[PDB]
């Protein structure tokens, strides 16, 4: 143990730390070997992709047979120290650390991605986490990570329906998913003022999507020229009242619902 | 040949008590009688002061960096009976926690292995040791070992999370048995090993070889060795190395490393557990290494020239 | 005020408050004395004048928050003053609504 | 020609403005304006002489900003050539053009005296804060917030641009320019504020000598 | 229930001796929550043990 | 609808605004509001009173919520489009009218709905914004809706009122003040010398008062360096701040009243950390002005170690040495009350933090100048006092050790 | 009991006791460490939810003023959904135990799926 540790420390000081890993891999004891290799990776692994860093990583993975997971774990820990939450999430994903990745994405990346409308960026992480083999290992996937993914999928399906003259079957699938999202957006745990802002923007967008879907599900047989599309209030009101909206917007929505309900009562007399 | 790589002007207004590098060796924390903790970025032979942390009402004795997986966290302890937890968020340092559960000077702080979470041991001149645990949810949890040392506890140091040899004897499917242990030194001339059992701290071992106050204790990092090693130093001018070859026998053997002509204040292991630094009242830092025959030799006497 | 010259009285009162010649301790009483003029059927205080009164009420509230060490928010004189303040807020809001309507009707 | 080319009806000579300006700069125009025109004892006797040369000097950076950028890049090249010749122990080449140095000296000498109190140096300054002077309660034209004229924004950008990474060859000409532009009560206060703003950006890292050489901290620390 | 907290409260009523950690002033189960004050550390450990066993039962 | 548009236009042109308000508009109410809103959106805010008409129209029908929304939209557009003293006065009046309308509503419904700042109100009839390729840019299908509560409208009202107070004090600033954020407005009020209005604005927006204290310190410095003209100009901005006790005794200079104002603000606005005192001292020292004894004595009682670092930062070695001599005398028991030290150096007293590193920097800075017999006399006086302290500390530590070594027989 | 289970000022086991008693699965799961504990928590809350639904359907005079969460009241329980949630867990121990031959047998015996 002294010979392996002393020569590995000499190689670390000379900057040949990839060969210090090779020296540590000769340690007979598996737990001591594993601890020493991970400790050296956590010290010397660089997050910046230089041709030299990539040559050293290729040497460890392909010649030394070191698990690529441990190199990615060390890069995730280093990215956390540097404050780069994006690279931390990327390396936790590549490192097969699904639970830490999901907690980081939901607490720190999801709100900033929703507020900036960068849905493709949030979908790259949540899409890979959504695999049926990974989801089983993720704590609280259904209450957080899935809600953001299902929200992105509802936006993507609405953008597709705006570009193609779509069949009524895709509109019913969109309606059922939007109605499910209205229930799950309330259950998002908000820790920061940004998370509340993102939850309120999701709630506002989901309510507007629900109105558009309910307006498009109508057969074209009520064209009396001069009234806005008749949104059925009985299907809309139970879902708008459950959405975590800002007080000003909830009051505008309730004023719109009360004015449209008064118009339904004036047209049925 | 040991060579000076860099000289840091700390701009402290009074005596510096401790100086700790972060896990990556890119940041230096220092603490002083001036009641401040200073943090420097140390890169390419430059230093930049990045924080002046104020919150102690007396001399700050020790600083300790937490493991980087929990972010940039620093503990400090002081004569003012406080332990302060500092954290960097978005490039700003703040006081995230203050512990005032000691009745006298808190002389030493040491973070546990990261496998155990955010756990801090604190040794005090009230003779107690406090274990502070942060679970991520709610307030810091506190376990106090009352009367850990008679007169006072001077130093605390955590054992490695994995027992020596446990990676060699495991057939491919049992998780390493993580045992929370630390060593303490006190004004009762004792070195004591503590173990957590059933959520309570017990005195596991009592190590008797010093004839005056134990000033410092350092548990050696276990990199692939089958042995546990502790260093201790004392007011009696002695440094002992304690070895245990079997974690089941609980048998600790003292070896006298050296007898200095003055008090020995500090002992610190290299990260590779192959060099021991020893700091005396003679203003010298000596470096010691074990030879293949198990003999300890002084490999550097760094005279403070200038 | 006794001679029923309400417009001139209102202007003087406002001047006394804005000239900062009044002791801070007397500001509540002065505001309370404005209360009957604020609740008159005829708009005596303009929208601008009402904003000024509102500012004075806020300045006081701010001054009270700076003078009260956290250890004396517990004895029985905070409830009457709070009621007076609420009454004043309501009166100021009502006058402001009336003044905007009247001033706006004259500008059309 | 550059002024007229902003208006659609004279296309035939629109490209002839830049080559004529390069020929004029090649003829030492700024040096001649400094020594022969502004240096004449009789230049300061007629207000309209000052207004017309003021306009000529201020129209150059406002109408031809790409030529000002070329003169700067050339002065930075010439400064590198002088530094390289000095390191080799050689005399600097006699073919070096001082066009930008002469423009800075021209601005410095033109504004050195204001005998008619015209305050024409104010076009180089942009107020960053509204002066709370409560003491002229006496003209009933409330106009909050005119944006400074586009001309004054370009000239104040010129003064700031000329300070950024200043070569050792332009140090003295730039200080002489600022001295000319600091003639008058408001001009002096804006120059004071500029030199104060240049010092404030680095109190916590004593190992990088990255302060602007044109700052109050540098002047008094040097003394 | 809360024998150590009760003991410390009774002792504070009898001796004005300085600087002991502020503890709950009332012995109803809501007192720690309502007052945001801790129990004695022994009573808190005894309650954590008891609650774990009640959950197991 | 076309006849209704014609009726609304002709009645507005004929100034017959009463008939337009009194008409029942059975089922046409939303269309009338839409027509008058569209015209109020199309027309210049200073020439025609369509917002005041919409407000009268909603007040008459007891629709206080829509009346408040219209007057708030009017106030916002006036702030954007009409950056004149008269525009700011109308903006303050429209926000006041909005606040009054919402106070007549039950608190549960006292909220206005706004499209977020950056929602392009496409002017109805603007040609679709074509991209470079001539395609109609798809309308961004999320007008994010912001709900404004009465407290947020009170902040916007205070902000418009502070813009109007600045524009009344200096009519040239009206154009700048109209666009200023709350932070920029604090800087402009501080330049004008309207410190109470700046403090009120900092309290409403929860901004740091640091810029107010720096600016007041800068005005006090300029007054102390300024001739008779600066003293005359100072009465104008001093009168604009609530000195609750201006007794104009014929003997107070404008500089003395500016310092009394500073003392009154430090007393009214205590920060938990010495930040405001530090900021003032650091500003005074940056201008080479001698520190007032009252400020030194207050700061000695709060943080003498930070004061010593400030004197060292500005090379004030004599004052730094006198402060250390007095602080050491205070620790020894002479004048301990002047430094906030509850108990002097005894075996049983709490450990006072001794700023040893700053005192060692002072000893180094006094020692680097071997030529100055004065610095050596100070350094020898300081050393002799440090030795007296270390001897008394050793004795107090030995007497503490003896107190700890008497056996517990009780 | 539901509100007491959500209040983080209470101990995790006190929260879990009131969570078991009120049907709050989210506050019960953090103390369930084994497969058997996790299955018990889902089935216990399923039975409590279905019982609460039948009581509310039968009693014409429920005052709306005391809302339990809609997610608990409108829960569409199936035997399969419990074992799907057990496969979606982040708890490594439960995922390992869910592959044991007897726990696979017990799952299929519960589902009544012999095939």
Provide an overview of this structure:
The structure is cut from a larger assembly and holds one copy of chain A (269 residues), one copy of chain B (306 residues), one copy of chain C (108 residues), one copy of chain D (223 residues), two copies of chain E and one copy of chain F (410 residues). With 269 residues, chain A is mostly helical. Chain A contains 14 helices and no strands. Helix content of chain A is 74%, strand content 0%. In chain A, helix 2 packs antiparallel against helix 3. Chain E is mainly alpha-helical and 57 residues long. Chain E is 58% helix and 0% strand. In chain E, 11% of the residues are buried. Chain F has 410 residues and is an all-alpha fold. Chain F contains 18 helices and two strands. In chain F, helix 5 runs antiparallel to helix 6 and helix 11 runs antiparallel to helix 13. The chains are: A mainly alpha (269), B mainly beta (306), C mainly alpha (108), D mainly alpha (223), E mainly alpha (57), F mainly alpha (410). At the C-F interface, helix 3 and helix 4 of C face helix 4, helix 6, helix 7 and helix 10 of F.
Structure, briefly:
Chain D is mainly α and 223 residues long. Chain D is built from ten helices and no strands. In chain D, α4 (47-63) runs antiparallel to α6 (99-110) and α6 (99-110) packs parallel to α8.
Secondary-structure-based class of chain E equals mainly alpha
Give the % helix of chain F.
Answer: 55-70%
What is the strand arrangement across the widest sheet of chain F?
1-2
Provide the β-strand percentage band of chain E.
under 5%
Please work out how many helical segments of chain F DSSP would assign: 18
- What's the end-to-end separation of chain F, in Å? 100 Å
Assembly annotation:
part of a larger assembly
Work out the number of β strands of chain E: 0
| Most residues in contact: chain pair | C-F, 32 and 36 residues
Give the helices and strands of chain E as they follow along the chain.
HHH
């Amino acid at each position: 143990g002294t010979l392996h540790a002393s020569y590995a420390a000499q190689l670390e000081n000379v900057g040949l730390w990839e060969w210090a890993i090779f020296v540590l891999l000769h340690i007979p004891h598996p737990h001591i070997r594993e601890a020493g290799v991970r400790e050296l990776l956590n010290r010397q692994c660089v997050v910046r992709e230089s041709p030299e860093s990539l040559a050293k990583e290729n040497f460890l993975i392909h010649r030394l047979c070191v698990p690529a997971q441990w190199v990615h774990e060390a890069k995730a820990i280093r990215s956390r120290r540097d404050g780069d939450r994006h690279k931390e999430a990327l390396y936790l994903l590549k490192g097969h650390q699904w639970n830490p990745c999901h907690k980081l994405v939901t607490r720190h990346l999801a709100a900033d991605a929703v507020i900036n409308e960068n849905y493709r960026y949030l979908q790259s992480f949540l899409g890979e986490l959504s695999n049926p083999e990974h989801c089983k290992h993720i704590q609280d996937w259904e209450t957080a990570g899935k809600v953001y993914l299902d929200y992105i999928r509802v936006i993507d399906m609405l953008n597709l329906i705006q570009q193609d003259e779509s069949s009524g079957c895709e509109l019913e699938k969109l309606h059922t998913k939007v109605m499910s999202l209205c229930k799950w957006v309330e259950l998002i745990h908000c820790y920061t003022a940004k998370d509340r802002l993102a939850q309120s923007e999701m709630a506002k967008r989901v309510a507007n999507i629900l109105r558009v879907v309910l307006s498009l599900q109508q057969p074209p047989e009520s064209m009396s020229d001069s009234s806005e599309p008749r949104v059925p209030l009985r299907l809309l009101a139970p879902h708008i009242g459950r959405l975590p909206m800002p007080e000003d917007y909830a009051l505008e929505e309730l004023r719109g619902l009360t004015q449209s309900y008064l118009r339904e009562l004036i047209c049925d007399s | 040949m040991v060579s000076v790589i860099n000289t840091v002007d700390t701009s402290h207004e009074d005596m510096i008590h401790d100086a700790q590098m972060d896990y990556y060796g890119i940041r230096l924390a220092t603490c002083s009688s001036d009641r401040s903790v200073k943090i420097f970025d140390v890169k390419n032979g430059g230093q930049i002061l990045i924080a002046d942390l104020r919150g102690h009402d007396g001399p700050v004795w020790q600083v300790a960096w937490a493991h980087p997986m929990y972010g940039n966290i620093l503990a400090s302890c002081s004569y003012d009976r406080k332990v302060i937890i500092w954290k960097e968020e978005n490039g700003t340092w703040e006081k995230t926690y203050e512990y005032t559960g000691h009745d006298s000077s808190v002389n030493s702080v040491c973070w546990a292995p990261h496998d155990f979470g955010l756990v801090l041991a604190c040794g005090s001149s009230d003779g107690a040791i406090s274990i502070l645990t942060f679970t991520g949810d709610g307030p810091w949890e506190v376990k106090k070992i009352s009367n850990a040392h008679t007169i006072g506890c001077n130093a605390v140091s955590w054992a490695p999370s994995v027992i020596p040899g446990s990676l060699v004897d495991q057939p491919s499917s049992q998780k390493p048995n993580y045992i929370k242990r630390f060593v303490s030194g006190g004004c009762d001339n004792l070195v004591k090993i503590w173990r957590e059992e059933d959520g309570q701290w017990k005195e596991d071992q009592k190590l008797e070889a010093h004839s005056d106050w134990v000033r410092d204790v350092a548990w050696a990092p276990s990199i692939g060795l089958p042995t546990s090693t502790i260093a201790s130093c004392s007011q009696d001018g002695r440094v002992y190395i304690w070895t245990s070859d079997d974690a089941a026998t609980n048998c600790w053997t003292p070896k006298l490393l050296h007898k200095f002509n003055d008090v020995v204040w500090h002992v610190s292991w290299s990260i590779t557990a192959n060099i021991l630094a020893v700091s005396g009242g003679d203003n010298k830092v000596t470096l010691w290494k074990e030879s293949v025959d198990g003999q300890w030799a002084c490999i550097s006497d760094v005279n403070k020239g200038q | 005020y006794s001679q029923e010259q309400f417009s001139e009285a209102a202007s003087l009162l406002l001047s006394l408050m804005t000239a900062r010649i009044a002791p801070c301790s007397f500001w509540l009483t002065l505001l309370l004395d404005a209360l009957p003029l604020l609740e008159q059927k005829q708009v005596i205080f303009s929208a601008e004048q009402t904003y000024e009164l509102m500012r004075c009420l806020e300045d006081r509230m701010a001054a009270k928050l700076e003078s009260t060490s956290p250890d004396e928010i517990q004895k029985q004189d905070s409830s009457i003053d709070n009621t007076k303040v609420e009454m004043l807020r309501l009166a100021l809001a009502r006058n402001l609504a009336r003044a905007i309507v009247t001033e706006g009707a004259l500008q059309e | 020609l550059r002024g007229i080319s902003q208006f659609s009806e004279v296309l035939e000579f629109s490209e002839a403005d830049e080559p004529m300006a390069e020929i004029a700069i090649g003829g030492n125009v700024f040096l001649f304006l400094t020594e022969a025109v502004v240096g004449s004892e009789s230049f300061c006797t007629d207000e309209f002489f000052i207004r017309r040369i003021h306009k000529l000097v201020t129209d150059f950076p406002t109408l031809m900003p790409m030529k000002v950028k070329q003169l700067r890049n050339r002065a930075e090249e010439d400064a590198r050539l002088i530094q390289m010749s000095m390191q080799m122990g050689n005399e600097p080449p006699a073919s070096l053009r001082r066009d930008l140095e002469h423009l800075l000296l021209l601005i410095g000498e033109l504004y050195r005296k204001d005998p008619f109190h015209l305050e024409l140096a104010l076009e180089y300054w942009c107020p960053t804060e509204p002066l709370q002077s409560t003491s002229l309660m006496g003209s009933f034209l409330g106009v909050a917030h005119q944006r400074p004229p586009q001309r004054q924004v370009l000239l104040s950008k010129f003064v700031r641009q000329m300070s950024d990474l200043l070569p050792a060859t332009l140090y003295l000409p730039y200080l002489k320019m600022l001295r000319g532009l600091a003639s008058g009560p408001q001009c002096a206060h804006y120059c004071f504020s500029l030199l104060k703003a240049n010092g404030g950006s680095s109190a916590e890292n004593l190992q990088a000598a990255g302060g602007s050489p044109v700052s109050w901290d540098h002047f008094f620390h040097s003394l | 229930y809360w024998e150590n907290t009760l003991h410390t409260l009774k002792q504070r009523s009898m001796l004005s001796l300085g600087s002991s950690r502020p503890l709950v002033s009332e012995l109803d189960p809501d007192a720690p929550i309502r007052q945001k004050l801790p129990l004695d550390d022994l009573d808190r450990e005894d309650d954590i043990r008891l609650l774990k066993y009640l959950f197991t039962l | 609808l076309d006849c209704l548009r014609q009726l609304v236009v002709v009645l507005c042109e004929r100034s017959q605004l009463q008939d337009l308000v009194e008409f029942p508009y059975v089922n046409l109410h939303n269309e009338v509001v839409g027509i008058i809103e569209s015209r109020a959106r199309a027309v210049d805010l200073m020439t025609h009173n369509y917002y005041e008409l919409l407000y009268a129209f909603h007040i008459y029908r007891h629709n206080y919520r829509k009346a408040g929304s219209v007057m708030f939209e009017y106030g916002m557009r006036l702030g954007r489009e009409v950056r004149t003293l008269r525009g700011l006065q109308k903006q303050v009046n429209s926000y006041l009218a909005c606040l009054n309308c919402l106070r007549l509503i039950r608190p549960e419904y006292a909220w206005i709905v706004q499209p977020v700042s950056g929602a392009v109100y496409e002017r109805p009839g603007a040609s679709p914004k074509r991209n470079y390729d001539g395609e109609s840019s798809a309308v961004p299908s999320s007008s994010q809706i912001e709900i404004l509560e009465l407290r947020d409208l009170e902040k916007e009202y205070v902000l418009a009122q502070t813009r109007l107070t600045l524009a009344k004090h200096n009519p040239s600033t009206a154009a700048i003040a109209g666009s200023s954020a709350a932070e920029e407005m604090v800087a402009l009020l501080v330049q004008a010398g309207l410190f109470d209005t700046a403090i009120s604005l900092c309290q409403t927006f929860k901004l740091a008062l640091t810029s107010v204290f720096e600016g007041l310190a800068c005005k006090c410095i300029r007054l102390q360096q300024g001739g008779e003209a600066a003293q005359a100009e100072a009465w104008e901005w001093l009168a604009a701040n609530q000195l609750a006790t201006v007794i104009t005794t014929k003997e107070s200079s404008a500089t003395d009243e500016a310092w009394r104002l500073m003392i009154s603000y430090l007393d009214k606005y205590e920060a938990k950390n010495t930040l405001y005192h530090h900021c003032i001292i650091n500003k005074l020292l940056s201008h080479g002005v001698p520190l007032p004894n009252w400020l030194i004595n207050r700061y000695k009682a709060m943080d003498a170690a930070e004061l010593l670092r400030l004197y060292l930062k500005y090379d004030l070695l004599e004052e730094a040495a006198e402060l250390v001599l007095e602080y050491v005398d205070a620790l020894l028991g002479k004048g301990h009350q002047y430094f906030g030290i509850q108990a002097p150096l005894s075996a049983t007293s709490q450990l006072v933090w001794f700023p040893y590193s700053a005192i060692d920097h002072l000893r180094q800075a006094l020692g680097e100048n071997e030529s100055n017999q004065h610095n050596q006399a100070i350094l020898s006086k300081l050393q002799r006092k440090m030795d007296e302290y270390f001897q008394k500390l050793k004795k107090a530590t030995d007497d503490y050790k003896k107190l700890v070594q008497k056996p517990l027989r009780a | 009991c539901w509100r007491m289970a959500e209040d983080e000022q209470f101990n995790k086991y006190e929260r879990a006791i009131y969570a078991t008693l009120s049907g709050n699965l989210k506050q019960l799961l953090p103390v369930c460490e084994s497969w058997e504990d996790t299955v018990w928590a889902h089935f216990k809350v399923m039975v409590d939810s279905l019982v609460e639904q039948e009581i509310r359907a039968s009693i014409i005079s429920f005052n709306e003023a005391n809302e339990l969460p809609r997610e608990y009241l409108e829960a569409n329980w199936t035997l399969d959904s419990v074992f799907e949630e057990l496969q979606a867990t982040d708890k490594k121990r439960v995922l390992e135990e869910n592959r044991e031959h007897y726990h696979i047998i017990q799952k299929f015996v519960i589902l009544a799926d012999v095939d």
